[PDB]
């Protein structure tokens, strides 16, 4: 998942 990565979760 995207929300799995911090580089994405940053905006989750």
């Amino acid at each position: 998942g995207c929300c799995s990565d911090p580089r994405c979760a940053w905006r989750c």
Side-chain angles (χ1 to χ4, degrees):
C2 195
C3 193
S4 195
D5 284 78
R7 209 181 290 173
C8 166
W10 261 340
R11 299 185 179 182
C12 172

